[PDB]
Design a protein around this ligand. Structure first.
Ligand SMILES: *[C@@H]1O[C@H](CO)[C@@H](O[C@@H]2O[C@H](CO)[C@@H](O)[C@H](O)[C@H]2NC(C)=O)[C@H](O)[C@H]1NC(C)=O
Ligand SMILES: *[C@@H]1O[C@H](CO)[C@@H](O)[C@H](O)[C@H]1NC(C)=O
Ligand SMILES: *[C@@H]1O[C@H](CO)[C@@H](O)[C@H](O)[C@H]1NC(C)=O
Ligand SMILES: *[C@@H]1O[C@H](CO)[C@@H](O)[C@H](O)[C@H]1NC(C)=O
Ligand SMILES: *[C@@H]1O[C@H](CO)[C@@H](O)[C@H](O)[C@H]1NC(C)=O
Ligand SMILES: *[C@@H]1O[C@H](CO)[C@@H](O)[C@H](O)[C@H]1NC(C)=O
Ligand SMILES: *[C@@H]1O[C@H](CO)[C@@H](O)[C@H](O)[C@H]1NC(C)=O
Ligand SMILES: *[C@@H]1O[C@H](CO)[C@@H](O)[C@H](O)[C@H]1NC(C)=O
Ligand SMILES: *[C@@H]1O[C@H](CO)[C@@H](O)[C@H](O)[C@H]1NC(C)=O
Ligand SMILES: *[C@@H]1O[C@H](CO)[C@@H](O)[C@H](O)[C@H]1NC(C)=O
Ligand SMILES: *[C@@H]1O[C@H](CO)[C@@H](O)[C@H](O)[C@H]1NC(C)=O
Ligand SMILES: *[C@@H]1O[C@H](CO)[C@@H](O)[C@H](O)[C@H]1NC(C)=O
Lengths: 205, 368, 413, 99, 50
């Protein structure tokens, strides 16, 4: 199944305040009006990076797994919401072939009503995470509008990632691509709008 | 202010001295460009305490003493046009000094006509100055005095339309705004070029000096020096080319000051369209505005015409004006305004007989 | 004179230099010193390993204050190899390792690059290129006992020698003859481990020592162990050199009304210039302003007249540098005169200067000309009763000097 | 040698670029001087302040090194007196204007 | 149209864009120069048949 992304999946590209200005930047972004794969839990490619989102009121989705094998032979990232707190580890996990939560390790870290959105990318040995949360007018499809995902964590892992999978009900997956975006920063220094410069000839203009 | 970079820049010799000399020539020329437009008045002339100008109302182009001491239109003009080693230098004449010059040029023009440009300002009544400007376009001066209220109302109305335009739109001021925009884009480009690598390991000069040891850092810094020196040579060359265009524009404005404001030009289209009467200078940000007043002919009629007329075998030609007929009678009129007069021996001159002229017509010439 | 390359100077204003306010001091700021590496549980703990079975600690994701080791008098020997110990407070590494054991005071000499003998051969081997540190202390007070301590062992016998860091902990019988071992000693068959049997009466080379060996690596994966960041106090309203989080610069730091979002650390101008920062210790937003700079111009009458000059610090406030402030800059050595004249030497913003009377450079607002109220009325005319013939001169440039260059002789020759 | 070639070629390109910009200013000045020769020497100009200040009578060219000098001869009015004035005069119930 | 060269040319920053902007200003001026000379007449006047 497939759905439209609209203008979703923009995130703050750097740790820099800018105010009442239009800033042009090239990065891995989810292209505007691209389609996204829709699910109601296969192993998936990671490509250059992933946009992930879900509509939620119930804590069905708990975490993610990232690596090349995602299984035993080599180290893989694991991210889990341990109810009260987030837990992150990078062990060579000998865990299940079809993992879920029922109704050595070179690093470790500890931290429907809504749409909850996330972006994952793994540039030059750092695993980046960005996120945002909002109320919604529609349960079954991505909400038309604009808000930018803010960085959560920036982890010095150095692991090769080529695949991922989700740990568990609607969720969406889109792939980032190297794109130039023009980002509109307001007086509070928030990104409030964007142009995808390769969408159409007016956007190039 | 990296001392390691500064000692490598010594190897390039005169280049930074001759870039500063080139920009200093541009800066000194901007004061000269301004002085040649506005400082064309020998004395700061001022207008009398009462405005007895024959019904012409200059209050919106004259200074407002309640305010800088700019006119009402000069305030509309001033509202509608809008440190990496970089500096901006102040102009020699302040905006208040430029407004005293336009005030003196305007006051000299209104109180003395074309005379303050030739020598001492000689006073003349404003309707009598306008009558001489009607003779200057080839209209007889009784056409002014017989229409003086109409001419004054048409002027006062046409000045009101300038206020309405400059209050509601900036479309014509794009010439002055483009000069502000081009210099701002050129400086933003020069500063943005400090973010570039030019092939170096980093665009940041302290960063190079931390990542590499002395001899390897020196090779990477020379790429930043090479690219930044080229980046600045590109800016200074473009400012030299752009200043040559602004000097051509300032020489034109200085010639319009002399020929349109200090005089009455015969030159077609030099002081606006129609026959030039007079014009008024108003100051603007980085520029001048001329309000050109012209006579435009408005309501033509067809007439039959002839080059000459026959009387007692003599061919008569008009001394000034042209022969016309209303279909039955023949008259002489001035060329630029229909005012018909009876053809007489003192409206005309004789030359030879009736045989030579192609299209001559027979008539009485009255002898007073 | 040196700016113009001349012993004679004509009247004018000449830029001879650039003024630039120098930094009064250097600021360094980094986040509060935290997540120190766990070395107290390596060095200061109660238990310690036998040399045949050394405990290895892996050190990662932390700040390593090596000065707590190298400045401490707590050690009988401290050494580093390939790297100076004082430089380990600056260096950062992908991983670090600490290997720990109890050893007799003589066999401590076998804890070195590429060594040989019973410890290097059969217990703990370091490679010939070992880059790292070794820290050793006598432990006769802890690790010796009356009648001999049985807690501490070394391997005497093995089939072959150890490779670098080969952590073999086996008790297998070494055999060198035809009689089978079956898991016990016999003819040419030997149990591999022996006790040191440490006693407090022993001579120094037969006393126990505790030892830790440190190894470092920097790889393609980012440095997880790093040098502890020092920091200064924070200085406002003065020109300083600065470093926040490794963003270095020079400027004046001031309190600001900018509203950074919680993740944002720096602020940028329209043209990429950094114009604000967050202090990483106490999260204020500081506006960064350049230290004051501008041209220095020397205002001179010609040297034919006098040697006096005035100096203009262009766009500078006199607080940063007779002394007089103008919108063109701070003006020094010119007398301010408040009776106006035609412009002799142009300074800017309506100000000019001249050399005048007891004689000095003077500075004044320029005069545009004499005032004149023209005697207008709707009734009066002025008519000239006489004339003057005037002859006026105009000079115009028409040509330059014609020049040619052989570019091959200029460049090469 | 390539460092010398690069710097000397940039040094010479900077000179030729500034001589091209400077020659365009001298051409504008020579076009102005050629116009003053026609309009101020070969004629009598009615253009205000084109041939000096006052009303232009005539002008004379003198040569100078790399330039021209124009000696502009003008009429300047000198000793004004005040008078009462009128635009027209009444006679036999009719208005007369000065011819 | 080499990509290997094009990605090195990006390291020189604004130079390429400001060369295109300069030549575009030349080109727009040539049409202006032509309007200023020829487009002075308000109406397309025609001579009579005789
Ligand atoms: C041409 O102009 C003359 C006036 O100069 C007109 O002649 C007068 O016409 C009125 C009646 O309309 C008579 O009362 C006058 O006595 C006429 N004056 C003279 C001098 O004859 C004439 O009508 C006009 N012709 C046309 C065709 O309009
Ligand atoms: C979504 O995109 C894929 C790949 O371009 C395409 O195969 C699929 O048909 C698209 N689906 C919709 C509904 O646009
Ligand atoms: C900016 O921040 C202020 C508080 O600092 C807030 O009142 C305002 O709503 C924000 N947004 C805009 C557009 O000013
Ligand atoms: C002159 O014009 C202004 C603007 O219309 C008006 O306010 C003023 O009353 C006029 N004065 C006279 C004397 O007509
Ligand atoms: C003059 O006469 C011709 C023919 O009647 C006509 O086309 C033209 O419009 C007339 N012009 C005027 C000013 O009446
Ligand atoms: C105008 O042309 C007619 C013939 O159509 C001729 O009779 C007349 O003399 C001509 N007049 C002039 C002024 O040429
Ligand atoms: C003009 O008058 C003369 C003398 O009466 C006559 O010979 C001639 O034919 C007339 N011309 C015209 C055009 O009527
Ligand atoms: C750093 O330590 C100081 C000690 O006074 C404290 O006030 C401040 O909150 C701390 N900041 C952070 C970011 O931990
Ligand atoms: C110069 O500096 C002082 C002290 O900051 C300030 O009071 C004064 O207004 C400044 N004047 C100018 C012209 O900058
Ligand atoms: C400057 O002006 C003051 C009055 O404001 C006057 O007393 C003083 O003498 C003047 N000084 C000079 C040197 O002109
Ligand atoms: C006119 O001026 C000259 C000096 O320029 C003087 O000699 C002469 O007497 C004056 N004539 C009159 C009538 O004033
Ligand atoms: C003309 O009249 C005015 C006003 O009375 C007076 O100021 C001036 O001195 C008079 N004389 C001349 C020669 O202008």
């Amino acid at each position: 199944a497939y759905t439209n992304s609209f203008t979703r999946g923009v995130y703050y590209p750097d740790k820099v305040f800018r105010s009442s200005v239009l800033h042009s930047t090239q990065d891995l972004f989810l292209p505007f009006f691209s389609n996204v794969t829709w699910f109601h839990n296969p192993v998936l490619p990671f490509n250059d990076g992933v946009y992930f989102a879900s509509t939620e009121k119930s804590n069905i989705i708990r975490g993610w797994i990232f690596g090349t094998t995602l299984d035993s032979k080599t180290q893989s990232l694991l991210i889990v919401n341990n109810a009260t707190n987030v837990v992150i580890k990078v062990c060579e996990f000998q865990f299940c072939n079809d993992p879920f939560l029922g109704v050595n390790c070179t690093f470790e870290y500890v931290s429907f009503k809504n749409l909850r959105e996330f972006v994952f990318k793994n540039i030059d040995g750092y695993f980046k995470i960005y996120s945002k949360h909002t109320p919604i007018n529609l349960v079954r499809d991505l909400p038309q509008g604009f808000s930018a995902l803010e960085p959560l964590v920036d982890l010095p892992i150095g692991i090769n990632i080529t695949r991922f999978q989700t740990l568990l009900a609607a969720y969406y997956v889109g792939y980032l691509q190297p794109r130039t975006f023009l980002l509109k920063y307001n007086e509070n220094g928030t990104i409030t709008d964007a142009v995808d410069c390769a969408l159409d000839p007016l956007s190039e203009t | 202010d990296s001392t390691e970079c500064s000692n490598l820049l010594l190897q390039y010799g005169s280049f930074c001295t001759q870039l500063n000399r080139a920009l200093t020539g541009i800066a000194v020329e901007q004061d000269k460009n301004t002085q040649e437009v506005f400082a064309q008045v020998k004395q700061i002339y001022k207008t009398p305490p009462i405005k007895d100008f024959g019904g012409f109302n200059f209050s919106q182009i004259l200074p407002d003493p309640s305010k800088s001491k700019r006119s009402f239109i000069e305030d509309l003009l001033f509202n509608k046009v809008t440190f990496n080693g970089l500096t901006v230098l102040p102009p020699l004449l302040t905006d208040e000094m430029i407004a005293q010059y336009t005030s003196a040029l305007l006051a000299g023009t209104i109180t003395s006509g074309w005379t303050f440009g030739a020598g001492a300002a000689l006073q003349i009544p404003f309707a009598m100055q306008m009558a001489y400007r009607f003779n200057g376009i080839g209209v007889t001066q009784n056409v002014l005095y017989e229409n003086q209220k109409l001419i004054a109302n048409q002027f006062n109305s046409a000045i009101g339309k300038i206020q309405d335009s400059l209050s509601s739109t900036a479309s014509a001021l794009g010439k002055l705004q483009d000069v502000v925009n081009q210099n701002a884009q050129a400086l933003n480009t020069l500063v943005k070029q400090l973010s570039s690598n030019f092939g170096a390991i980093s665009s940041v000069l302290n960063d190079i000096l931390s990542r590499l040891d002395k001899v390897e850092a020196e090779v990477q810094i020379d790429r930043l020096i090479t690219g930044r020196l080229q980046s600045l040579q590109t800016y200074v060359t473009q400012q030299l080319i752009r200043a040559a265009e602004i000097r051509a524009s300032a020489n034109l404005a200085a010639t319009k000051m002399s020929e349109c404001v200090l005089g009455q030009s015969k030159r077609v289209d030099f002081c606006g369209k129609g026959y030039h009467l007079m014009s008024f200078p108003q100051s603007a940000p980085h520029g001048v505005v001329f309000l050109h007043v012209t006579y435009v002919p408005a309501q033509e009629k067809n007439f039959t015409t002839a080059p000459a007329i026959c009387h007692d075998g003599k061919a008569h030609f008009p001394r000034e004006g042209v022969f016309v007929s209303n279909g039955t009678h023949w008259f002489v009129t001035q060329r630029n305004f229909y005012e018909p007069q009876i053809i007489t021996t003192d409206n005309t001159f004789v030359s030879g007989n009736c045989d030579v002229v192609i299209g001559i017509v027979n008539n009485t010439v009255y002898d007073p | 004179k040196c700016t113009l390359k001349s012993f004679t100077v004509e009247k004018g204003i000449y830029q001879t230099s650039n003024f630039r306010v120098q930094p009064t001091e250097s600021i360094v700021r980094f986040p509060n010193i935290t997540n120190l590496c766990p070395f107290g549980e390596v060095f200061n703990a109660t238990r310690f390993a036998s040399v045949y079975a050394w405990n290895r600690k892996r050190i990662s994701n932390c700040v390593a204050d090596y000065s707590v080791l190298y400045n401490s008098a707590s050690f009988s020997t401290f050494k580093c190899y390939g790297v100076s110990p004082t430089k380990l407070n600056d260096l950062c590494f992908t991983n670090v390792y600490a290997d720990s054991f109890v050893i007799r005071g003589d066999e401590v000499r076998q804890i070195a690059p590429g060594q040989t003998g019973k410890i290097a051969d059969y217990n703990y081997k370091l490679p010939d290129d070992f880059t790292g540190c070794v820290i050793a202390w006598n432990s006769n007070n802890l690790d010796s006992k009356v009648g001999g301590n049985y807690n501490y062992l070394f391997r005497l016998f093995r089939k072959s020698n150890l490779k670098p860091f080969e952590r073999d902990i086996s008790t297998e019988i070494y055999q060198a003859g035809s009689t089978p071992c079956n898991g016990v000693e016999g003819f040419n068959c030997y149990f591999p481990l022996q006790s040191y049997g440490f006693q407090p009466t022993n001579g120094v080379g037969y006393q126990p020592y505790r030892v830790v060996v440190l190894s470092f690596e920097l790889l393609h994966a980012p440095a997880t162990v790093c040098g502890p960041k020092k920091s200064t106090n924070l200085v406002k309203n003065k020109c300083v050199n600065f470093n926040f989080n490794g963003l270095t610069g020079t400027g004046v730091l001031t309190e600001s009304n900018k509203k950074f979002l919680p993740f944002q650390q720096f602020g940028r101008d329209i043209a990429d210039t950094t114009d604000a920062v967050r202090d990483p210790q106490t999260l204020e937003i500081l506006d960064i302003t350049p230290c004051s700079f501008g041209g220095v111009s020397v205002i001179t009458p010609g040297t034919n007249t006098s040697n006096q000059v005035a100096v203009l610090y262009q766009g500078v406030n006199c607080t940063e540098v007779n002394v007089f402030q103008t919108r063109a800059g701070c003006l020094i050595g010119a007398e301010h005169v408040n009776n106006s004249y035609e412009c002799d030497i142009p300074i800017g913003a309506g100000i000019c200067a001249s050399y005048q009377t007891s004689q000095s450079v003077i500075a004044y607002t320029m005069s545009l000309g004499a005032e004149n109220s023209v005697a207008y009325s709707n009734n009066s005319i002025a008519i000239p009763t006489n004339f003057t013939i005037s002859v006026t001169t105009e000079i115009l440039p028409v040509s330059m000097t014609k020049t040619s260059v052989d570019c091959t002789m200029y460049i090469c020759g």
